[PDB]
Design a binder for these strands. Structure first.
Ligand SMILES: [Mg+2]
Ligand SMILES: [Mg+2]
Ligand SMILES: [Mg+2]
Ligand SMILES: [Mg+2]
Ligand SMILES: [Mg+2]
Ligand SMILES: [Zn+2]
Ligand SMILES: [Zn+2]
Lengths: 176, 97, 131, 162, 38, 222, 45, 68
RNA sequence: ACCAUAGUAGGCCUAAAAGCAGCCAUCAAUUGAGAAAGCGUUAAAGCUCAACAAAUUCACCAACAUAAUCCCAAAAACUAAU
């Protein structure tokens, strides 16, 4: 009856929302899909939520295609941060170099979308940089020693800003 | 191409288009081809095949369409306009089928 | 009529002219195939099946393609471009491999073309293929 | 002038275009530099609804107007000619340019009221019950304002309302 | 139908037609968009 | 195929704080005690003040004369304030808050007895004056779209204009008057008192030149 | 300049001028220049 | 999960190739300054991409008044 | 008329905010298509707009019910009018 885009964590597939309202509305077995999906995704111990394309057929049976995990995750891990910037570009979330983006790129080159496209890795790296811009993550050419000088400064500043934001969020939760 | 999709092409068996690319008069038949070949009309029924016959020498462009009424509709585009072919196609192949 | 207001070439037009000149220089096999409406999925699949034999596809507007081609040595291809079209570009050509994929889709015609300076109809490509 | 023919033979239908001979523009126009067809014959501001020989040249055998880009009329003059053709139809000129319908000629209606120079369509017009006095008066339109530039030999402007 | 002094299309499906010496707005999708110029 | 065109870019536009229209007061802070006679002569004829643009590139232009009272101000304020992007546009009052006392008597009074009591205040607006001035990184068309509403709901006839539109219609206005084919202009006749026509004319006409009559202004009049 | 006009299936009997003048320049050679020709074509290809 | 990377931990949690192994393009790409209109050459394709984008933005702003 | 595929459910707050309660960036694949101008959804999915290609007559604004005994000259678009 159509298609479904489902972004789901590595070892986690559960018979409730999102899968319950989504797959349950199409008339498709939830448990069979949890079984197959977990069969395929228990082999990734990297713990990466992957967007996946679920083809849901007229007879209520189904097919499944697993793609590469989200760039949001790959970059959240590359900068070592947890959540992305509240105000992006106004503030910084995390830092990365050429190497991170390149790795993530040749990883996502086998993604369903970039597979059919014969595009070189320069293009995919462009894509990932762009995806970094909005995630609040900053690239630098050669940062390594200053990568750690940074991390010891930047992390303290991000803790300062996250604690200040948590305090101001406590004050705005109390004022509300 | 939109007016063909609304009209439920599933009543058709086989559609072939025979035309001669290097002639000056073939634009009409080509327009008809690209109007029938579109995804809407093509997906209305999968039991129908669309064949493009391309020859240099034939010199006379033509459109032949069989459908399950036991009917055969052959319109020779020479001096015929695209949307005249498509309107004829519509009123002919819909009202009968 | 009022006197004549000559229009001026944009950067777009010059870039397209350059690009097309290069296109006619580089590829040995340029095959005109009428552009036909397909799903985005199917068009991607087609592009990829052309990527497997390394053949590339290109699309240019009739507006800037027609004058270039009538002033070109290739002007005999003018009657081909009157409708919609798609230009199949091939460096170090193998025609039978293109015909293999075109065979799969019956409603997607190959019209004219030029293989190593030889201007051919579809039958010329059928002949070059079996060779 | 290109006729389209359709034939039915043994569950096979053939539709084909066929070209006939088109008459050509008369050899020697008075104002050859002139852009628009009306103007190079010096007919600007001269033809009226009454001149049929001119009007019948742009229309279809079934009585409707020919499109502008085909004819090549200056936009203004196209509108004028269209008005005139409507008026001429209504006036009972061009009786041969109607569509032919074998059934409907038989059922007589009250004999056609003779009219001329009629701007609106007969079916669309409410009878004016209230007239009105000298100072506020409802006037009845005659002819079309598109023609108000026709050359007047009397010198008095045409009267468009009474 | 509503008699109005100003006609305006309320959606993309409204079309605008001159009948009986008036202007009209007919709409096939939403009949509620019908309008007759006064 | 269609060739593109360079898009208008605004790097020079500086947006002020409080871009939205200020709230204006129903009655002035120092309410006028002494009742004023009504000059109708302050609605009459062409406007002197507020004829030109200042900061902004768009405006509402008054084609008639009239009186703006508080209701009108409220209308404009609310409408413009929720029809604009506070980031990209700013608006400005080209009109003062209503200062002119206007009286009434209780309905049902006989004629005479004195002047009335002060009911409300208004602002006089002479034709040719800008009511509200909007600047921003906007193109004229959006602003035009919603400004024409406000314009339409004003007491006098009014338009939405830009700098370009205004200068366009002024040059058109003078070009119409040097094109004129007929020898006889209202100016030429009135000033020279031809036909003793001054008898029927007002003195003000010598300035107004038949373009303004009462509070009405007809732009077509050369 | 311009390129070929692409004759085709229904009637094409026409072979190029080049092939014919080449077979004509081949037929006019003595067998010592035919063996020279054969050697010079055997080596390159 | 969560990972705290230092110069010991960012290199130990990843396999980081030498600087001579990495391709050229990786160093050329602009890190943080997304390009402007005036900067680009009108004879370059990217310029026209950007101009198209801006034209779309403009159309989008102009379409804010839709009744439909 | 025509057509709609890519990172990607962009980052956040929220039960959920998947182009489209809100706040911030507004980059990037493909000849070409906005981190989206309207509809739509609980969040989607789904319809359209702008984009390619296809083409190209012209297209900015303008329209507004009514009274009381019975409508109220008759009529009329050209033979020459400062
Ligand atoms: Mg008003
Ligand atoms: Mg792009
Ligand atoms: Mg579109
Ligand atoms: Mg009523
Ligand atoms: Mg009477
Ligand atoms: Zn003309
Ligand atoms: Zn509607």
């Amino acid at each position: 009856s159509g298609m479904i885009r489902a972004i789901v964590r590595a070892g986690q597939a559960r018979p409730g929302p999102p899968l319950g309202p989504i797959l349950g509305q199409r008339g498709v077995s939830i448990n069979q899909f949890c079984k197959e999906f977990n069969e395929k995704t228990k082999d990734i111990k990297e713990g990466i939520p992957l967007p996946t394309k679920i083809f849901v057929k007229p007879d209520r049976t189904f097919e499944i295609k697993i793609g590469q995990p989200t760039v949001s995750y790959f970059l959240k891990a590359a900068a070592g941060i947890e959540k992305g910037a509240r105000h992006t570009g106004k503030e910084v979330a995390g830092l990365v170099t050429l190497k991170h983006v390149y790795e993530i790129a040749r990883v996502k080159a086998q993604d369903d979308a970039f597979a059919l496209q014969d595009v070189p890795l320069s293009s995919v790296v462009r894509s990932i940089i762009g995806s970094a811009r909005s995630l609040g993550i900053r690239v630098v050419k050669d940062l390594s020693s200053e990568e750690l000088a940074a991390f010891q400064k930047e992390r303290a500043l991000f803790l300062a800003a996250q604690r200040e934001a948590d305090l101001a969020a406590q004050a705005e939760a109390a004022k509300k | 191409a939109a007016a063909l999709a609304r009209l439920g092409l599933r009543a058709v068996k086989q559609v072939r288009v025979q035309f001669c690319p290097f002639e000056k008069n073939v634009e009409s038949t080509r327009t008809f081809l690209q109007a029938v070949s579109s995804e809407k009309v093509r997906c209305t029924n999968l039991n129908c095949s669309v064949i493009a016959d391309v020859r240099h020498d034939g010199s006379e462009p033509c459109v032949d369409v069989l459908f399950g009424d036991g009917h055969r509709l052959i319109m020779r585009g020479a001096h015929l306009t695209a949307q005249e072919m498509l309107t004829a196609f519509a009123s002919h192949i819909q009202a009968r089928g | 009529p009022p006197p004549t207001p000559p229009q001026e070439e944009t950067g777009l037009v010059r870039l397209l002219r350059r690009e097309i000149a290069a296109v006619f220089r580089d590829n040995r096999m340029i095959a005109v195939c009428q552009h036909v409406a397909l799903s985005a999925e199917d068009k991607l699949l087609l592009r990829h099946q052309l990527r497997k034999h390394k053949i590339l596809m290109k699309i240019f507007p009739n507006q800037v393609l027609k004058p270039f081609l009538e002033e070109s040595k290739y002007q005999n291809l003018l009657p081909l471009f009157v409708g919609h079209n798609l230009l199949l570009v091939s460096e170090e050509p193998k025609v039978k491999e293109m015909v293999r994929i075109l065979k799969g889709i019956p409603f997607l015609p190959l019209l004219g073309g030029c293989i190593d300076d030889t201007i051919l109809s579809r039958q010329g490509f059928i002949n070059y293929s079996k060779l | 002038f290109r006729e389209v023919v359709e034939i039915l033979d043994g569950k096979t239908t053939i539709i084909e275009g066929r070209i006939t001979e088109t008459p050509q523009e008369s050899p020697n126009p008075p104002n050859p530099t002139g852009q628009c067809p009306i103007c190079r014959w010096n007919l600007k501001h001269k033809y009226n609804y009454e001149d049929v020989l001119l009007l019948s040249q742009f229309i279809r055998p079934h009585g409707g107007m020919l499109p502008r880009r085909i004819t090549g009329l200056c936009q203004e003059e196209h509108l004028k000619i269209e008005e005139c053709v409507k008026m001429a139809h209504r006036a009972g000129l061009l009786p041969n340019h109607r569509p032919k319908l074998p059934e409907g000629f038989v059922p007589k209606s009250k004999p056609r009221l003779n009219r001329y120079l009629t701007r609106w369509s007969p079916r669309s017009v409410k009878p004016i019950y209230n007239k009105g006095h000298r100072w506020n008066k409802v006037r009845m339109p005659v002819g079309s304002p598109l023609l108000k530039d026709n050359v007047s030999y009397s010198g008095r402007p045409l009267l468009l309302y009474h | 139908f509503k008699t109005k002094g100003v006609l305006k299309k309320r959606c993309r499906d409204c079309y605008l037609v001159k009948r009986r010496g008036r202007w009209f707005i007919y709409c096939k999708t939403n009949p509620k968009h019908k309008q007759r110029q006064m | 195929f269609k060739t593109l065109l360079p898009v208008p870019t605004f790097e020079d536009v500086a947006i002020p704080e409080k871009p939205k229209l200020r709230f204006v007061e129903r009655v002035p802070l120092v309410p006028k005690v002494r009742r004023e006679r009504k000059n109708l002569s302050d609605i009459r004829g062409p406007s002197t003040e507020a004829t030109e643009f200042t900061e902004g590139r768009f405006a509402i232009l008054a084609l008639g004369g009239g009186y703006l009272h508080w209701g009108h101000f409220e209308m404009m304020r609310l409408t413009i304030n929720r029809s604009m992007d506070p980031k990209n546009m700013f608006a400005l009052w080209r009109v003062p808050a209503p200062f002119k006392p206007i009286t009434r008597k209780g309905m049902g009074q006989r004629m005479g007895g004195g002047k009335g009591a002060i009911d409300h205040y208004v602002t006089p607006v002479k034709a040719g004056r800008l009511i509200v001035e909007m600047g921003g990184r906007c193109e004229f068309k959006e602003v035009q779209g919603f400004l024409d509403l406000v314009a339409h709901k004003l007491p006098f006839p009014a338009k939405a204009v830009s700098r370009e539109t205004l200068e366009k219609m002024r040059k058109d206005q003078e070009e119409r008057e040097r094109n004129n084919q007929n020898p006889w202009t209202f100016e030429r006749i009135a000033t020279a008192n031809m036909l003793g026509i001054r008898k029927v004319l007002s003195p003000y006409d010598l300035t107004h030149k038949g373009r303004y009559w009462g509070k009405f202004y007809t732009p077509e009049r050369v | 300049e311009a390129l070929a006009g692409a004759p085709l299936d229904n009637a094409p009997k026409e072979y190029p001028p080049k092939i014919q003048q080449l077979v004509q320049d081949i037929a006019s050679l003595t067998l010592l220049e035919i063996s020279d020709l054969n050697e010079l074509l055997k080596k390159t290809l | 999960h969560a990972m705290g990377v230092n110069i010991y931990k960012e290199g130990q949690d990843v396999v980081l190739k030498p600087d001579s192994e990495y391709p050229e393009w990786l160093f050329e790409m602009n890190v943080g300054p997304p390009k402007k209109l005036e900067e680009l050459d009108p004879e370059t394709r990217e310029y026209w991409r950007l101009l198209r984008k801006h034209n779309i933005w403009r159309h989008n702003r102009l379409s804010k008044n839709r009744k439909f």
